[PDB]
């Protein structure tokens, strides 16, 4: 019945303690917060100078100066921003969770061009993380020079300062603690202001005092040097940035002695707004696929300040060589400003990035030489992507280049193969091995090369992973020439010759099958062998020779599967070779002759060797060869 309404208030002490201790991960953040607030004040005073320039008569230039002083453990951040009045001082720096920047922005007109950093209202108090007492001296038009001072004790003192006239500006004076006196030197300051807040629209000038005084020989009396040297070009509109400026931006962003290779600069204007800049390096990093704990070199910026890096869901893994930045104007941001609220947004960014960089690759493929350099250096990443993702695979396939029998010396794409395919040909014959030369002279390709068809040379271990999932390309199916059921478009008298050769050698294959027992699962007359006695081939389903070799040699392999996934061999003989005919004479003459037995054993050994398989115990084969040699020499 009786309802006593109230309104929340807060316990200040524990609130300040929470803000200081429990918000930010690493104490180095404080510099970013102060710098961003100072830049906010800078653009504040800049905006108002448009209407009237007289308000800029106090101070013309707009800059930020850092003056670390080791004698007094004071790190001073002085700027020429708008400043504060007394009442503004009290209301902004006293009232927690109130931000004068947000109030000024919302009070501004609708169509304005300012983009201020923060609106939360608590970023300043982070300074305490590395200071005991903070002193803020600021002089702003319509008011005199006032002095702020607080020790985070729940109290602050505001006193009219009588120091030197600062003009329209604001300087913050921190008194660091001995535990944090490291930030006084210049190395960590440089590293921080380059990591965060590097792309700030105003010059940041360090003011170290490294005067030698070694007696004219004195050097570096006072050192003024800029840090935010490179402007953020992605903010600028494209079609005006020539292909040059991208070069310097690349060299500065990532230390490199050479230009980039290609650049994609685009932007999205939906309810999720962001601009992006993507570089593809000219040199593949040596430690790239080496796991450096650095998954993506893409840096995420929000209003030109650093947010997060190496958050893998930004870009898929195989596109890690891409280096560049992505800047959004507004996003849900965790209080510490180091991660997003709902990671669902990252998925949309990922999709946009992958489609845009795939378009970039497609456009790059229009040039031959540039592409050749790119492929030659990053082909592994494309095949990795083909192996991993299953929705751009169709668009990823065209990019691949390959060596063919009719290619010569230069690589060629699958579309060229499809164009050069004959009318009756309905497949794409590929052969995987370990080197181009050995594959080119292999036994399987003889009949094909004789007939005139083309074949594909895949000579790197990364291939198998790609092809085993790339089972089709543009209506035409990929078939491996080292599979059991291989067929070619022939005539009918070819079939008659084949069946008559079967009816001639149907006993010899059984005879050789009882020998070699449990070493090969079947032995049949071949149709792909010319100028070679016999070759072995794996079954239609299961690992091929090179695949089994690869994943047997693969480290961190699971032994049980290696025993599980073993290929089932099938021996094939050439009914035209003189060796086979003479062996058939000897077999049909003497059902069992030892000479035949050892001969077919040795033949199978050599065939297993040439077929790409690795012999089980090479010592026995070597001993057989040595016995043959000793017999030949008369020993």
């Amino acid at each position: 019945e009786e309802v006593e309404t109230f309104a929340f208030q807060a316990e200040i002490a524990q609130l300040m303690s929470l803000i200081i201790n429990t918000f930010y991960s690493n104490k180095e953040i404080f510099l970013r917060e102060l710098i961003s607030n100072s830049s906010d004040a800078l653009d504040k005073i800049r905006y108002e100078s448009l209407t009237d320039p007289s308000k800029l008569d106090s101070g013309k230039e707009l800059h930020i100066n850092l003056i670390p002083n080791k004698q007094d453990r004071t790190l001073t951040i002085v700027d020429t921003g708008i400043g504060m009045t007394k009442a503004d001082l009290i209301n902004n720096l006293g009232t927690i969770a109130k931000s004068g920047t947000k109030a000024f922005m919302e009070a501004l007109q609708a169509g304005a061009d300012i983009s201020m950093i923060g609106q939360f209202g608590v970023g300043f108090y982070s300074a305490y993380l590395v200071a005991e007492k903070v002193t803020v001296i600021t002089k702003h038009n319509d008011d005199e020079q006032y002095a702020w001072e607080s020790s985070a004790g729940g109290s602050f003192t505001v006193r009219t300062d009588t120091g030197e006239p600062m003009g329209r500006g604001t300087k913050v004076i921190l008194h660091l603690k001995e535990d944090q006196t490291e930030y006084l030197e210049e190395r960590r300051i440089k590293e921080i202001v380059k990591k965060h807040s590097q792309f700030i629209g105003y010059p940041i000038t360090l003011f170290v005092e490294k005067e030698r005084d070694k007696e004219k020989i004195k050097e570096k009396y006072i050192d003024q040097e800029e840090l935010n040297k490179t402007k953020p070009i992605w903010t600028r509109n494209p079609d005006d940035i020539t292909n040059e400026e991208y070069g310097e931006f690349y060299k500065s962003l990532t230390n490199d002695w050479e230009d980039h290779l290609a650049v994609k600069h685009f932007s999205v204007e939906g309810q999720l707004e962001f601009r992006a800049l993507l570089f593809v390096p000219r040199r593949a990093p040596f430690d790239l696929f080496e796991n450096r704990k650095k998954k993506n070199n893409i840096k995420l910026y929000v209003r030109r300040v650093f947010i997060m890096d190496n958050c893998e869901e930004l870009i898929p893994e195989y596109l890690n060589f891409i280096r560049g930045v992505v800047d959004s104007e507004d996003l849900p941001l965790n209080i510490s400003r180091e991660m997003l609220q709902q990671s669902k947004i990252l998925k949309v960014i990922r999709k946009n990035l992958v489609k845009k960089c795939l378009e970039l690759f497609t456009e790059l493929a229009e040039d031959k030489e540039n592409y050749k350099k790119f492929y030659e250096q990053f082909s592994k990443n494309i095949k990795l992507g083909i192996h991993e993702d299953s929705q751009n695979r169709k668009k990823l396939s065209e990019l691949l280049r390959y060596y063919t029998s009719a290619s010569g010396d230069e690589m060629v794409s699958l579309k060229d193969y499809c164009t050069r395919m004959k009318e009756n040909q309905k497949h794409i014959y590929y052969i995987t091995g370990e080197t181009k030369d050995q594959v080119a002279n292999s036994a399987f390709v003889e009949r094909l090369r004789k007939h005139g068809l083309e074949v594909i040379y895949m000579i790197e271990p990364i291939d198998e992973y790609c092809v085993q999932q790339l089972k089709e390309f543009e209506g035409k199916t990929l078939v491996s020439v080292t599979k059991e059921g291989l067929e070619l478009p022939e005539d009918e008298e070819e079939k008659k010759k084949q069946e008559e050769k079967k009816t001639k050698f149907e006993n010899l294959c059984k005879i050789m099958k009882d020998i070699l027992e449990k070493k090969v699962e079947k032995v049949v007359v071949s149709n792909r062998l010319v100028t070679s006695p016999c070759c072995i081939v794996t079954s239609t389903y299961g690992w091929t020779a090179n695949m089994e070799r690869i994943m047997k040699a693969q480290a961190l392999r699971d032994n049980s599967t290696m025993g599980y996934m073993a290929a089932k061999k099938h021996l094939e003989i050439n009914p035209d070779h003189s060796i086979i005919e003479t062996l058939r004479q000897k077999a049909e003459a003497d059902k069992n002759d030892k000479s035949v037995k050892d001969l077919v054993i040795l033949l199978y050994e050599t065939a297993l060797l040439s077929s790409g398989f690795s012999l089980e115990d090479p010592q026995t084969h070597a001993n057989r060869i040595y016995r043959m040699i000793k017999l030949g020499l008369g020993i």
Partner: protein
């Protein structure tokens, strides 16, 4: 048929004990999207089931679900248990009937279809120490100065951590000798003061060029605090470029105030090797700026254009061309030709 007691196992099957043989019942609920995995279990179990062993009528059991049930062959590594060959389904089939997707009857799931690109690993061959590698072969001065620059970067990175690797000789150092790939050098102390380690690395540098180091031969190889009684410098062969001769001349000098620290020597080697021979480098004519630093980096690649076979050179260029400061670079570009001019 009688069966045993009721227990739950695997959350995908029941377990009784029939009259003894174990009836591993299978309960499939086709109302959820996991029943597809459960029909996969239906397929993957009963691997040795006979082809004509089914006891479920067609009017009660859908032939389309059980036609390829009987398995001709399958490894089935995961699950061990098994049931007899039969299936039961209500005449008017249970609620949420199987959709009968008629999917891929003649297709066989290739056992072991699931493969994985396992984690990638790196190999660093450490076959020999420095003394043996320089006793078997002695390389040309280019990659020799490269190795000296590697050693100088290492010894700078060490002492800047606080500890002083005073004992540094030919044996403590290890060489990751790639067979024909150029040898990468690493610092170590498997064999158990500022600028003293620099003196040691200068003596070792004199050694690397194929000449015996007199501070190693006669003595005083521990540290130069025991001042050698030669009071001169041994003459490295003239084949070496006078730049590194001046470097190893100033590094192991008597005076401890004149000895250039490891950073200035490292980046003066950076200037000499990579930054091409330009009149800006000499006569201290380059006005030091970070812009001129990036211009020198732009001059760095021309050391790849002719020296690219050396994987070590591109490696070092990727590793150390980023870490170099304006102050030490100014001091380096000053000293390098305030000696060379000798005005």
């Amino acid at each position: 048929y009688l069966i045993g007691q009721s227990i739950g196992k695997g959350c995908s099957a029941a377990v009784y004990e029939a009259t003894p043989l174990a009836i591993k019942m299978m309960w499939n609920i086709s109302a959820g999207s996991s029943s597809e995995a459960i029909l996969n279990t239906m397929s993957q179990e009963l691997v040795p089931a006979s082809r004509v062993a089914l006891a479920g009528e067609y009017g009660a059991v859908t032939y389309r679900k059980s036609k390829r049930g009987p398995k001709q062959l399958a490894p089935h590594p995961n699950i061990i248990r098994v049931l007899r060959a039969f299936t039961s389904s209500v005449p008017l089939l249970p609620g949420a009937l199987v959709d009968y997707p008629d999917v891929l009857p003649s297709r066989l799931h290739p056992e072991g279809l699931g493969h994985g690109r396992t984690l990638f690993l790196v190999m660093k061959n450490y076959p020999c120490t420095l003394r043996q590698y320089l006793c078997v072969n002695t390389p040309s001065p280019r990659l020799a100065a490269m190795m000296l620059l590697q050693l100088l970067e290492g010894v700078d990175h060490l002492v800047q951590q606080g500890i002083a690797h005073r004992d540094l000789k030919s044996d403590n150092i290890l060489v990751e000798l790639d067979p024909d790939g150029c040898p990468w050098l690493v610092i170590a102390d498997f064999g158990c003061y500022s600028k003293a380690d620099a003196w040691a690395v200068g003596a070792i540098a004199y050694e690397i060029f194929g000449l015996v180091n007199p501070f190693y031969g006669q003595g005083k190889a521990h540290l130069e605090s025991r001042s050698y009684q030669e009071a001169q410098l041994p003459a490295l062969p003239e084949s070496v470029p006078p730049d590194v001769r001046q470097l190893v001349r100033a590094l192991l000098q008597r005076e401890a105030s004149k000895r250039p620290s490891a950073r200035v020597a490292a980046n003066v080697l950076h200037l000499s090797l990579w930054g091409e021979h330009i009149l800006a480098l000499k006569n201290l004519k380059l006005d030091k700026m970070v812009g001129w630093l990036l211009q020198q980096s732009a001059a760095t690649l021309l050391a790849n254009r002719l020296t690219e076979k050396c994987c070590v050179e591109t490696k070092m260029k990727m590793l150390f061309l980023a870490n170099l400061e304006c102050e030490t670079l100014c001091q380096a570009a000053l000293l390098l030709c305030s000696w060379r001019a000798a005005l």
